[PDB]
Design a protein around this ligand. Sequence first.
Ligand SMILES: [Mg+2]
Ligand SMILES: [Mg+2]
Lengths: 281, 281
Amino acid sequence: TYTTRQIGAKNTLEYKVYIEKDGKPVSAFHDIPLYADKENNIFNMVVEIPRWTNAKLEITREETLNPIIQDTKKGKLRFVRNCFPHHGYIHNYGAFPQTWEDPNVSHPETKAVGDNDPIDVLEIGETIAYTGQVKQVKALGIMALLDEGETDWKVIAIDINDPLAPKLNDIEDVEKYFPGLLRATNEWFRIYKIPDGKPENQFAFSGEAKNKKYALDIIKETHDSWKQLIAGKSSDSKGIDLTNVTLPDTPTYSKAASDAIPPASLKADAPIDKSIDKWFF
Amino acid sequence: TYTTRQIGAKNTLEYKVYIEKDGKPVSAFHDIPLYADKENNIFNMVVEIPRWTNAKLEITREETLNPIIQDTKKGKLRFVRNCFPHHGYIHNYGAFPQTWEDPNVSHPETKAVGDNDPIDVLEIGETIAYTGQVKQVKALGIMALLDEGETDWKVIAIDINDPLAPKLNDIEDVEKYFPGLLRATNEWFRIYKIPDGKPENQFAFSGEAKNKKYALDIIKETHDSWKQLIAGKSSDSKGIDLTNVTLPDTPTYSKAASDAIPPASLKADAPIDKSIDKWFF
Ligand SMILES: [Mg+2]
Ligand SMILES: [Mg+2]
C-alpha cells in the first residue's frame, strides 16, 4: 500500500512497477485495501497512468503480485494516441484494488459482461500522479462505459488532499468546479480508440454521470465479485493470478511470494517513438 | 543553423540555449537566414517552446547572440498555466529569424505598431519540436492579436517534413486537416493570460486567420525592417543587441562573440513546481 519497485526503464518491454508495503512487494490487485476508511467511504486508488501521458500501463492480471506493466499489441508497446483537443489521458488513471468487472455475467445496466479488470477510476485533482502511487480518494460519481462492448464503469474521484476535496461531495460539484470536464470525459472514452482502427465506444444512460450513491452501489458490486474470485469461487477466473500475501483465508495466499520478486532496477525512461506525438483530428 | 548549446539547467534563471552552426554559436535573431529557399518561400523557423509544455521561453533581443531564455517577471520565472481543454502550449511556438516588428511603424487594417520582436510562428505539425531547433516550414496563414496598441501577428506554419505538408498550402487546408485547431488557437490566445490575472486578449479581423499571401506580405515586411535594423539604420534599436558573427559588413559583426560563449552545461532539468500541473477552468 506504500512504496514502488521499478524494474528497468519506463517505455520499455522490461518495465514493471510493483507496489511495496514496507519495502516488500504486495499484489496491486488483491493486497491493497479497497477502503482506506470504510467509515467515510475513502478508497485506496492505485494510479496506473498519469494525466497527459500515453503509455498504456496496467495492473497485469496474470503476473504474480500483478505489477503494472505496459500493454502490448502484437508484441509492440501500446500507447493511447492524442485525440484533439486532448493530450494523452485527461485524468490520472487507475483502479480500485479488490474489485472485479465480472466477465462471466451480463451486467443489467449495460447488458454486457465485464471487462475482467478492477474497476477503473478517474481522479480529477490538480496534481499529476505517478505510476504505482496509492492515493486516497472519495467517489463523486460513475459513468457506464461500454469499452469494446464490455461493461467498463469509470468512477469519478478526487484525491483527499486536493485543495478542492472539501468542496467536492457529489457529481454536481464536478460540473460546478470543473466545467466541461465530464462532457470531455464522455467524449474522450468514446473516441480514444479510433486512432487504433477501432470503433467508437458507447455509454449507457446517454453518458450521464451517475451520482455518488450510484457509484458506491456499483463499486460494492465489483468488490463482491472480487471476494468470490479471490475465494476461488468464480466460475472462471479467466487466467488471473490470485497469488496474494495479505489474505490468509484465501487458497492462493503466500507471504513469501513477495520475496521472489527481483529487487528494484530503475533505469532512466527510455525515449518514446516520435509518432506518439501526433495529434489526431 | 545546425545544433544547440544549452547553458544552465532547464527551468532555471540561468537557463539559456544557443543555436550553433557547425559547433560555433551564432545569433538566433540575426545569423539564421529567414529563407531556407527564397523562391519557394521555405523559411527557417527558430523553435522556442515545444508543444504541450508550459515554460515561457523566448529569444532575448537584449543578450549577445540572442539566446533563448525563460521569461521572468520581477524575478519569477514565467510559465503559461493549463487552460481547459488545453495543456500548456498547443503549438510548437517559434519565431522567424531576421524579422522584426518595428515599434515605430503602424498597420492601418490593424491599427497598431510593432512589438519590437521577431515575428511569431505557430508550427502546427505532428512532431513536438525542441527549444533552439531550426526547422524548415511553409507559411499557411496569419492571425493578428492586438496586445495594447501593437499588432502581434502569428504566422500559422507547417514543417516541410511533416507527412501532411504536401496536402497543406493555404489556411483553408488547416480547417480541412486540423478541424478545430483554428478556434483553439483563437481561444488559447484569448484566455491564456486570464489565469495570470490578466484580461482576455483581442483579435483583429474578428479572429480571422488571413491566408498565405497575406502572411507572405507581412513576413517580407518584417524582414525589410530587420534589414534596416541590422544595418544600423533603424530609428530606435533600444535594447536590441545586434551582435552577429555571419554578416561581415554590418556595424555589429563580431566573430569573437561566438568565441565568448560558455560550454554546454552538464545539469539535469530543474524540477517544476507542482502548481504548474493545475488545470484551470
Ligand atoms: Mg477496465
Ligand atoms: Mg510578438
